[PDB]
Structure 1
Amino acid sequence: QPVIPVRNIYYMLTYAWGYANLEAIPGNNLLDILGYVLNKGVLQLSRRGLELDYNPNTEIIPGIKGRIEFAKTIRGFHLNHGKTVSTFDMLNEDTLANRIIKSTLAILIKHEKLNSTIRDEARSLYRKLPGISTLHLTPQHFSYLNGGKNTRYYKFVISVCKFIVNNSIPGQNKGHYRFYDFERNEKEMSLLYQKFLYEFCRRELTSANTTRSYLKWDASSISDQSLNLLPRMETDITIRSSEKILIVDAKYYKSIFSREKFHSQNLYQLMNYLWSLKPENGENIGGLLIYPHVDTAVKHRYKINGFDIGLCTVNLGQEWPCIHQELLDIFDEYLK
C-alpha cells in the first residue's frame, strides 16, 4: 500500500485553490501539516487585523442609538418605561467567516490523532476569541460565502477549512474526531490532479493561453437535435498556443504506480475529443496523457492516427521544485 509522501500533497492543494516552510514540522501525516498551516495561518490574519463587518442591531435600549424605528417603538409602548427601538451598527468580528475559524478549531482540537504542540497552541487561540460564537458547521455555510467579499487571504484558510471538515470522521469516541484516509481513494485524488493542473497551467504557462473547452459532437440525429443521450464531453484542460494546440487528460491510478499491464482506459476519451474538435486556426493538434508515478518519470511519443500524442509520467516523491521544473520541461516538448 504505497502512497505519495504527504508533505508534497499540500502543494497540490495550493494550485487547486489558487492561493511557507514545511521542513520545520516533524509530523509526516497530513493533519499535522494542515493543522500547522491553519494554526500559523490564523496568526498572520490577526497581526494585520481580522475582518470586521458592520452588523445592524435592532434592540430595546435605555436611550437613542442611531435611527429609532417609530413603528416598533409605539407598538411596544417602550417610551413609557424609558426604552426605544433603534437600529444601529455594532462593529464585530462575529461574521460567518470568522465563526467558521473558531468552530473549525474545535474540530481540529477534537481530532483524536494529532501532534501535542498543535492541539495546545490552538486551545489558547480558541480562548483568545471570546466574543465570537461557536457554530455547528455544514457545507451550506461555506456555500453562502462564495461571494468572497473578504480578502484573498481569508479565502485561503477557509478553503483549507472546507477540506478539513469534509475530511473529518468520528473515531474511537463519540466526541473526538478522526482524519479521513484521503490518499487511498483515487477519485478525490483524481479530481485534485485535474484541478491541480488546470489552475497551475494558468500560473506558469503565461506564454500559452489555457482554457477548459466544451465540445459538441459532429453527429446529426433525425430523432433529436438535443443528443441528450450522447455523452457530455468536456475537456479536462486545453492549453492553446499560436503554433500548436494541446488537449490533456490526466488521472490518478493505483495500478500505474506499480511498475505489467498498463491502465490507459482514459485514452479512449482523448482521441474522440480530437476528432470532434476542429481547429479554425488549423495550426496543429496534439495530445497528452500524464499520470502520477512514484519512483521515476518516463516520456513517450506516438503517431497514432495522424495525431502526435505523448504518454508521460512524473516522479512524485522526488522534490517539489524539480517537479515544478519537470512539468515545464514536459509541456515545452509537446507544446511545440
Structure 2
Amino acid sequence: QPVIPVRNIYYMLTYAWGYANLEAIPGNNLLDILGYVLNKGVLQLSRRGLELDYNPNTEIIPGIKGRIEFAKTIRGFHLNHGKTVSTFDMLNEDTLANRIIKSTLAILIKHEKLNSTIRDEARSLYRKLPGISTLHLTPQHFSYLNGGKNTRYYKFVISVCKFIVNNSIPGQNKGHYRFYDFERNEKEMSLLYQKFLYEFCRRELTSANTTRSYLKWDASSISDQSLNLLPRMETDITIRSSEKILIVDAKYYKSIFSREKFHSQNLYQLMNYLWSLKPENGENIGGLLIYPHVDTAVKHRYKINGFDIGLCTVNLGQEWPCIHQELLDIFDEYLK
C-alpha cells in the first residue's frame, strides 16, 4: 500500500497554487508540514505587516467623526442627547482574509494527530490576534475572496487554509479534528497531478507556449447541431511550440504503482483528441502519456496510427530537484 513521501507532495501543491525549508521538520505526516508553513507564514507576514482595509463605520457617537449623516440623526433625534449618526472609516485587521486565518488556527490546534510544537506555537499566535473575530469556515467564505485584492503572498497562504478546511474530519472527539487521508484518493490526486503540471509547464518551459485547448468533434449530426449528448472534450494540457505541437494526457492510478497488466484506458481519450485537433501550421502532432511510479522511471515511444506517442513514468520519492531534472529532461525528448 505505497504512496509518495509526504514532503514532496507539498511541492506539487505549490505549483498547483502558483505560489522554504522542509528538511528541518521531523514530522513525516502532512499536517505537520502544512501547519508549520502556515504558522511560520503568518509570522513572515506579520513582520512586514498584516493587511488593513478601511472599513466604513456608521454609528452613534458623542461628536463629529468623519461625515455626519443628517437624516439618521434627525430621525432619531440624537441631537437632543448630544449624539450624531456619523460615518467614518476605521482601519482594522478584522477583514475576511484575516478572519479566515485565525479561525483556521483553531482547527489546526484542535486536530487530534499533530506535532506538539506546532500545536503550541499556533496557540500563541491565536492569542496574538485579539482584535480579530473567529468564524465558522465554509468555501462560500473562500468563494467571496476570489477577488484576491490581497498580495500574492496572502493568496498562497489562503489556499493552504482551503486545503485544511475541506480536508479536515472530526475524529474521536466532538470538538477536535482529524486530518483527511488525502493520499488514498486518486481523483483529487489526479486533479493535483493535472494542475501541478499545467502551472509547472508555464514556469520551466518558457521556450514553448503552454495552453489548455478545448476540442470540437469533426462530426455532423442531422438531429442536433449542439451535440450535447456527445462527451465533452477538453485537453488536460497542450504545450505548443513552433517546431512541434504536443498534447499530454496524465492521470494518477494506483494500479500503475505496482510494477503484470497495465491500466492505460486514458489512451482511449487521447487518440480522439488527436483526431479532432487540426493544426494550421501542420508541423507535426505528438502525444504523451505520463504517470507517477514509485520505484523507477521508464520511457517508451510509439508510432501508432500516423501519430508519435510516448509513454513515460517518473520515480517519485527520489528527490525533488532530480525529479525537476527528470521532467525537463523528458519533454526535451518529445518536444523535438
Deviations 1:281-320 (A, max 9, x none): 0000000000000000000000000110000000000000
Counterpart residue number, 1:201: 201
Deviation at 1:124, TM superposition (A): 0.7
Q: Tell me how far 1:57 sits from its aligned partner.
A: 0.2
Deviation at 1:121, TM superposition (A): 0.5
Cα distance in 1 for partners of 2:237, 2:31 equals: 30
1:200-249 CA-to-partner distances (Å, cap 9, x unmatched) read 00000000000000000000010111011011100000000000000000
Shift in Å at residue 88 of structure 1?
A: 0.2
Q: Which 5+ residue runs of structure 2 have no aligned equivalent? A: none
Corresponding residue number in structure 1 for 2:32: 32
Q: Using the TM superposition, give the Cα deviation of residue 27 of structure 1 relative to its aligned residue in structure 2, in angstroms.
A: 0.3
What CA deviation, in whole Å up to 9, does each residue of 1:28-80 have, x standing for no partner?
Answer: 00000001010011110000000000000000000000000001000110000
Separation of aligned partners in 1, 2:34 and 2:138? 20
Give the paired residue count: 336
Cα distance in 2 for residues equivalent to 1:146 and 1:302: 43
Identity %: 100
Corresponding residue for residue 123 of structure 1: 123
Q: How far apart, in 2, do the equivalents of 1:16 and 1:311 lie?
A: 23
Q: Deviation at 1:11?
A: 0.2
Aligned to 2:248: 248
The equivalent of 2:280 in structure 1 is: 280
Structure 1 residue 194, shift from structure 2 partner: 0.3
Q: Distance in 1 between matches of 2:33 and 2:122?
A: 14
Q: Equivalent residue of 2:57, what SS?
A: strand
Q: Please list every run of 5 or more consecutive structure 1 residues that lacks an aligned counterpart in the other structure.
A: none
CA–CA separation in structure 2 for the residues paired with 1:204 and 1:242: 17
CA distance in 2, matches of 1:57, 1:309: 63
Deviation of the 1:255 alpha carbon = 0.5
Cα distance between partner residues in 1 of 2:217 and 2:253: 28
The Cα offsets for residues 150-208 of structure 1, whole Å up to 9 and x where unpaired, read as 10000000000000000000000000000001000000000000000000000000000
Q: 1:120: Cα distance to partner?
A: 0.3
> 2:120 aligns to what SS in structure 1?
helix
2:185 aligned residue: 185
Aligned to 2:9: 9
Q: CA deviation at 1:105?
A: 0.2
Q: What is the TM-score with the length of structure 2 in the denominator?
A: 1.00
Find the counterpart in structure 2 of residue 142 from structure 1: 142
Shift of 1:324: 0.4
Shift of 1:110: 0.3
In structure 2, how many angstroms separate the alpha carbons of the residues matched to 1:20 and 1:179? Answer: 23
The offset of 1:140, in angstroms, is 0.2
Distance 2:83 2:130 in 1: 29
Whole-angstrom CA distance in 1 between matches of 2:280 and 2:321? 37
Runs of 4+ in 1 over 4 A off after TM superposition: none
Give me the whole-angstrom Cα distance separating, in 1, the residues matched to 2:7 and 2:78.
61
Per-residue deviation at 1:137?
Answer: 0.4
CA distance in 2, matches of 1:122, 1:220: 60
Distance 2:27 2:210 in 1: 37
Provide the rounded CA distance (Å) in 1 between the counterparts of 2:124 and 2:68.
40
